[PDB]
Design an enzyme around this catalytic site. Structure first.
Site, PDB file in Angstrom:
ATOM      1  CE  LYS B  82     -10.475   0.894   0.431  1.00 45.13           C
ATOM      2  NZ  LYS B  82      -9.737  -0.160  -0.185  1.00 45.13           N
ATOM      3  CD  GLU B 104     -11.256   9.337   2.208  1.00 43.47           C
ATOM      4  OE1 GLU B 104     -12.420   9.789   2.264  1.00 43.47           O
ATOM      5  OE2 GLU B 104     -10.893   8.378   2.933  1.00 43.47           O
ATOM      6  CB  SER B 369      -7.857  -7.142   1.570  1.00 44.50           C
ATOM      7  OG  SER B 369      -6.927  -7.117   0.503  1.00 44.50           O
TER       8      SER B 369
END
Ligand SMILES: C[C@@H](c1c[nH]c2ccccc12)[C@H](N)C(=O)O
Ligand code: NA
Ligand code: NA
Lengths: 386, 383
Positions: B82, B104, B369
């Protein structure tokens, strides 16, 4: 074996054979082609080396003094520089035909790093940890168990790091034919202080090439926190012959040196012999190890590595203290200002770097060793800050 | 804007102006030298790219089929892929003169990534988070606050991600002149699915060069977990035109597809409009509750570019249960000394099944990830 007068092999005769076997094995493999190809391969592909050298622009401009660079050992796999030493020694162990690793741990981070490297290499891992520390570090113990290691609580003595080391040494006497004892800092009897420093030197060699690239010159000051002293040695060592480069180790000042609750072995301790080494230790008047404290759990060892005692004696490096409160402020500050949550150990070096940068000019350069990331410390900081 | 029948820009008229601005600024800066200098500079020195490609030798030998490689996004700053997107958008926002980032978050993971990037660039960060999710993610809430972000609890409705999404949207309507809405996956109205995918594509570009270097060939299969779809698109996209390379996305099977407690929007959802896009969403046509042990796979929809890749059969999409993911979380930890994110453990689990049935000269790349440090509380309880 010696760094001036500090170091040695202050051990029972029962340890001389394992130690001599280790030094013989290390002399052979340290420069062996296949050993270094394999070591570099794991450091690169598994650990993520090289770690970057980051210019903390916002922190630098806020304080308005020297340029603060951070050597980002917080990005190594596991979150701390300890992994460099764990892989090195675990692979050395494997090359020696050993099938088991043992290690001490207090804060739990060395235990986790050892567990990780043992898992990587398919070795059994048994971690010795004082019951007081097992209680304080549930999350790190759980990491160790997740990684497949057995954690052996140590119920003798003061139930802490010093006692874990002694129990590990006793294990090693019985088991060295198939076991390697993976020491977690630049401490213990020869050849460990040298070996651990050699495996951590990668930090300083990368940092040297990176600062020459980014700035065209060597740094004015390198600042690193000092627990047992491995992260500091790793970054100091490749600059030891560069007379322009000032080296500063930062010890845990705790509640303040006058409070008696701290772990500043070099600033306030005395010469002594424990865990196979002649070095500086914090001792009661009867010559026993005294209680230590730091908010940073990786800084509470009552001793320090002999090579630092040497560097201080000959005045090649300066050694200073930072309090719990100063560390804690630098932890928050680095998080807010640069988006990096540092380990509380590393925050000590950041706190001192911030003080030093303020009295220096804007063309001068400080490299701080950011020895680890702060995820492991979030429970502590939530309790003590909010 | 469109990926076959999926995508679009379903927003109230008020948001058309800021989205057109965003599109034009993106087009301006994506290939701009100064923008890319700063971006690469931050990715290198702050985030630690490139991440390595790791040969999981013990896991590969143990299972006894295909070579398993792991793209180590668990080593990026923050511990999740991310960060690549948070930096990219935060820098875009700064180049657009914005002073504030909103976002969010359900798991807290995107909130932390956004908080980190905003701290780096000196921007105010407000994160909307449903009150129930606040309670469930105490430590991620704390990280965000440590990083200087405000966490706005949303107390309306079910007090979860959908309510937080509706609140962020209301905020952006009011504040867009100085505020960038930092969307965390390949989702949302155009141009967010394209932008986020472009900012994650670095994963795939690195992986391609690294596997060519390591093995002299492209992988046979690329496996990645799929919440909204950003890590998967990031690693997929540079291989989309390599016909040989199979692409496998792994959604949250949860307690079982039969159970009704999963997050497998592509496998079990229906096409419709949510969050400004036309894609697969889990619905009854109201948004149905979602579950995964991996909190990052709790998003009720999926990115339109995945719906497209599924439609044209360029990629295959599968599911892995909570149980299979948890076993792979333990297996990787024990076998390779890497504690994976529970999200990434879904991809590990599927790749392990797949590797067993493949040849030993064949290669699987798993996108790892993230790391599992954030999941230790969850895993302590469940395991
Ligand atoms: C700092 C580190 C450590 C591990 N072993 C040590 C030996 C001497 C001094 C320190 C250490 C810590 N106690 C740990 O176990 O993570
Ligand atoms: Na000490
Ligand atoms: Na979904």
């Amino acid at each position: 074996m010696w760094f001036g007068e500090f170091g040695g092999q202050y051990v029972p005769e029962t340890l001389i054979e394992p130690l001599k076997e280790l030094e013989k094995a290390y002399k052979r493999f340290k420069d062996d082609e296949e050993f270094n190809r394999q070591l570099n391969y794991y450091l690169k592909t598994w650990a993520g080396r090289p770690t970057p050298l980051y210019y903390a622009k916002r922190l630098t401009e806020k304080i308005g003094g020297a340029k603060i660079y951070l050597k980002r050992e917080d990005l190594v796999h596991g979150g701390a520089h300890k992994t460099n030493n764990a892989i090195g020694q675990a692979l050395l162990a494997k090359f020696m035909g050993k099938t088991r690793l043992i290690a001490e741990t207090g804060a739990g981070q060395h235990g986790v790093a050892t567990a990780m490297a043992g898992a990587l290499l398919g070795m059994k891992v048994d971690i010795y940890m004082g019951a007081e520390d097992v209680e304080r570090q549930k999350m790190n113990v759980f990491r160790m168990k997740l990684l497949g290691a057995n954690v052996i609580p140590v119920n003798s003595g003061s139930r802490t790091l010093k006692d874990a080391i002694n129990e590990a040494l006793r294990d090693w006497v019985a088991t060295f034919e198939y076991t390697h004892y993976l020491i977690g800092s630049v401490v213990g009897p020869h050849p460990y202080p040298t070996i651990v420093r050699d495996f951590q030197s990668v930090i300083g060699r990368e940092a040297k090439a990176q600062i020459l690239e980014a700035e065209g010159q060597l740094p004015d000051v390198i600042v690193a926190c000092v627990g047992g002293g491995s992260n500091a040695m790793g970054i100091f060592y490749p600059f030891v012959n560069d007379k322009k480069v000032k080296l500063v180790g930062v010890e845990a000042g705790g509640k303040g040196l006058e409070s008696g609750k701290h772990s500043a072995s070099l600033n306030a301790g005395q010469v002594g012999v424990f865990h196979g080494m002649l070095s500086y230790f914090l001792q009661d008047e009867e010559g026993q190890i005294k209680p230590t404290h730091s908010i940073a759990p990786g800084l509470d060892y009552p001793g320090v590595g002999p090579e630092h005692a040497y560097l201080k004696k000959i005045q090649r490096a300066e050694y200073v203290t930072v309090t719990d409160e100063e560390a804690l402020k630098a932890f928050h500050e680095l998080s807010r200002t640069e988006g990096i949550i540092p380990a509380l150990e590393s925050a000590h070096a950041v706190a001192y770097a911030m003080k030093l940068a303020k009295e220096m000019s804007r063309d001068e350069i400080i490299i701080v060793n950011l020895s680890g990331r702060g995820d492991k410390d979030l429970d502590i900081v939530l309790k003590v800050s909010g």
